[PDB]
Amino acid sequence: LSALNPELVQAVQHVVIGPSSLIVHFNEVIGRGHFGCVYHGTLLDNDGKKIHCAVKSLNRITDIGEVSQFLTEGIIMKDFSHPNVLSLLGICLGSPLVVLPYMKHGDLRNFIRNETHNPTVKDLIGFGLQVAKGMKYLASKKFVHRDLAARNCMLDEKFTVKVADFGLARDMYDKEYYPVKWMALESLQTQKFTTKSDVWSFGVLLWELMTRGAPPYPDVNTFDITVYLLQGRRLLQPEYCPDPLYEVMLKCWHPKAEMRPSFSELVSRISAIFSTFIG
Template sequence: MCFINRDNRFPGRLPLVVLPYMKHGDLRHFIRSKNRNPTVKDLIGFGLQVARGMEYLAQKKFVHRDLAARNCMLDENFTVKVADFGMARDVYAKEYYSIQDHKRVKLPVKWMAIESLQTQKFTTKSDVWSYGILLWELLTRGASPYPEVDPYDITQYLLKGRRLLQPQYCPDTLYVIMLACWDPEPECRPTFHSLATEVQHILSNLKGEHYISLKVTYVNLDQPRPYPSLVGSEATTSDLDTDSDGAS
């Protein structure tokens, strides 16, 4: 990235930001392409790169507020770059909605944490929630979250303890991490540092080369399950660090 005219050397001209060319476009388009045949390792590897990028942003006290596969870019070496282009709101217009009294503000409600849906306030911990949704996007090859839920009902849906189902080829350990990201209490969610560590561990121990088709299904096709902590599930997040790793 470089800046042009940042110090106003060319009076009358606006400053410009020049970004590297991202050969493979945004991550969601890439994983949804019928010409691609990603493995589970490939997809989790993308998730690891995003976790590391978000760890860096958190350390620098930045809150992203719109983390999603559509806002991550891929260069020629398949390196993920966490970005946030306003044009994503045009390309994926159907994924942004007005909520409550903020009728003029379009928000990515199905990627937002419960507290952000209620207060329109964002923190690193709400970014962690969105990261959990991004992991789910990866393991479903870009499926839209909560397809059966009206955007205007999403807050109540989540408050009832409902969460996204486990994708078919998603390792159980990775789904536990997703659920930790979706903890209703922000302070109980893991940090991006611990997320990067845990995802790296899962990736290192993954065996086999399972390819995911675009017709991916779910482990449980019943009604969405309540959040585990509300029903005494054995799923635990005790191994995940929940202290702050930067911004709050």
């Protein structure tokens, strides 16, 4: 660690959590191993307030080159915070640690699929509006997510949705062993991603919300999706999805990227749909 470049060490000081400020429960994993090496932890802020956090161990990092790159991703991610985006609490330098807020309800897809939970149509549109707000923020920063889906959004104790799976929180489902159906048509054809291809993914995420986590295009092979979309076939209107909300989804799947709504337009249109419900 003494081999680290000093101007880079100075640069990362506002992101670094001192080892005396973090208590990691290496004996308690979060999510039964489904999210890899992530543990319960306790972060002590400057005032001594105890913060329940999720601590990911980055075992895939060994050399000083990978360590430096990890410090930079930390510096960049610390500048991203919004109520609807998973916010980095900090980093710790065993293996390097990524400290994230604790999300009581885990991923959005498993929450809406859980038979014991009963989110209303209002609550579901509300989750889609929160995702649109988080994406509007990421898009304003010229950030292209590339993997927006309900599995990649987290839900906290106050039912606030956090767009995740970016920066140091990427490869969320990295399991140790012993997304073509969300992609825009041009991304399937050219392998190039833009904010307008994230708008497409957003439309598929809206459809996941309104069907309470059903898998998209279950009868279509991942190889056959391109042709299916070129024929002008699209995901159908879910049973209890309001028509103006389905109109919004169809706009997200326009074959011409330039004709799709912006995330700013999506927040505007969805906020007005959301306001029609009693609460």
